[PDB]
């Protein structure tokens, strides 16, 4: 109706409330817009027919519910949700309006970051992860493309991760289809931290096979104890791989990558390499926890003991049960969530 207008963005038609002006593409398809009612710049993400299949529906429903009930400084905040369509029968598209950030982490990694900026970004990432974990959300797919930053280096996680290709940041547990726990997300933090330091992707696998080879080449063949945690067919392949010693963390992250002009910087190089050695651990049973990572002397300098801890998200009733639905049930669930019914 007259409340909405249409603008062409890439291959997509954006039909948005008239409050949202001067849509520009960034990086669903996502636009920056000026919200004339808030008088602030916003991001608008279009979900096209999210109910059309159960996989898209589950992810879209979960994203709507979680972005609404989650309220944390390091998780992207919901401003608005709308559909241009007037009824359940005509319902097609969902628009999620969120806080506009300046860049994704991929852009920030290409800058010549010091210990101050790196440790501050990693502290915020770990804070965001700790909050998701407290809500029973284990992400499993954290990467530079789903973390955003403002020019003052404030950081926010964009989405809530996997149900239940760029695979550079996926933990061995994810790569090899293993059991996982909360510290699956520590691997991603380690990959990003290492990349910030080295200026290149740590494990740049071209496919699933190459991804595993890049990890074991750098870090070494994992212990026999780890091999017993694999599915039989996966265990055979992994054990059949050539043996690798890997490299010491001093050889993975040499001193020349860090400033060495003071005791402070010499200490920060040591602390950075120590935390890396504890996060980039193939065997999750020997890998640092998020709590331990936050308490690490590289990271804990950013902890303010006066800051009120955000309580766990109150996910209404159990509308995030892990139950499957028909396409028609998903459509009505998503529509109700958009309309507030
Ligand atoms: C304004 C803005 C700009 C961008 N810029 C880019 O995407 C960009 C620009 C240049 C180069 C690149 N390179 C790469 O990534 C390549 C990295 C390769 N390595 C992994 C090896 C990315 C990102 C987000 C925002 N702001 C914003 N705010 C709120 C929500 C959302 C949003 C976004 C996406 C989804 N949902 C919400 N975005």
Swiss-Prot record:
EC top class named in words: transferase
Chief location: cytoplasm
Signal peptide range: none
Activity regulation, free text: Activated by threonine and tyrosine phosphorylation by either of two dual specificity kinases, MAP2K4 and MAP2K7. Inhibited by dual specificity phosphatases, such as DUSP1. Inhibited by SERPINB3.
UniProt keyword list: ATP-binding, Biological rhythms, Cytoplasm, Kinase, Nucleotide-binding, Nucleus, Phosphoprotein, S-nitrosylation, Serine/threonine-protein kinase, Synapse, Transferase
In-chain residues carrying the UniProt-annotated modification S-nitrosocysteine: 106
Active site: 141
Family: Belongs to the protein kinase superfamily. CMGC Ser/Thr protein kinase family. MAP kinase subfamily.
Domain notes: The TXY motif contains the threonine and tyrosine residues whose phosphorylation activates the MAP kinases.
Name the UniProt record assigns to this protein: Mitogen-activated protein kinase 8
């Amino acid at each position: 109706d007259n409340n909405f207008y249409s603008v062409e963005i890439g291959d997509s038609t954006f039909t948005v409330l008239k409050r949202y002006q001067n849509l520009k593409p960034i990086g669903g398809i996502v636009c920056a817009a000026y919200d004339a009612i808030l008088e602030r710049n916003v991001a608008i993400k279009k979900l096209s027919r999210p109910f059309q299949n159960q996989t898209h529906a589950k992810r879209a429903y979960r994203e709507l519910v979680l972005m609404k009930c989650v309220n944390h400084k390091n998780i992207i905040g919901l401003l608005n949700v709308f559909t241009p369509q007037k009824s359940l029968e005509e319902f097609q598209d969902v628009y999620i309006v969120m806080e506009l950030m300046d860049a994704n982490l991929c852009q920030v990694i290409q800058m010549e970051l010091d210990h101050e900026r790196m440790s501050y970004l990693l502290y915020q990432m770990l804070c965001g992860i700790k909050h998701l974990h407290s809500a029973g959300i284990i992400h499993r797919d954290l990467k530079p493309s789903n973390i955003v930053v403002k020019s003052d280096c404030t950081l926010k996680i964009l989405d809530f991760g996997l149900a239940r290709v760029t695979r550079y940041y996926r933990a061995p547990e994810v790569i090899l289809g293993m059991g996982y726990k909360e510290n699956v997300d520590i691997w991603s933090v380690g990959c990003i931290m290492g990349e910030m330091i080295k200026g290149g992707v740590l494990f740049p696998g071209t496919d699933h096979i190459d991804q595993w080879n890049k990890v074991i080449e750098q870090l070494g063949t994992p212990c026999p104890e780890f091999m017993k945690k694999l599915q039989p067919t996966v265990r055979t392949y992994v054990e059949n791989r050539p043996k690798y010693a890997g490299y010491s963390f001093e050889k993975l992250f040499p001193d020349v990558l860090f400033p060495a002009d003071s005791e402070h910087n010499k200490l920060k190089a040591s602390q950075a390499r120590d935390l890396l050695s504890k996060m980039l651990v193939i065997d999750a049973s020997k890998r640092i926890s998020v709590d331990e990572a936050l308490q690490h002397p590289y990271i804990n300098v950013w902890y303010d003991p006066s800051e009120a801890e955000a309580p766990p998200p109150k996910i209404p009733d159990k509308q995030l049960d892990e139950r499957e639905h028909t396409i028609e049930e998903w459509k009505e669930l998503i529509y109700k969530e958009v309309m507030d019914l």
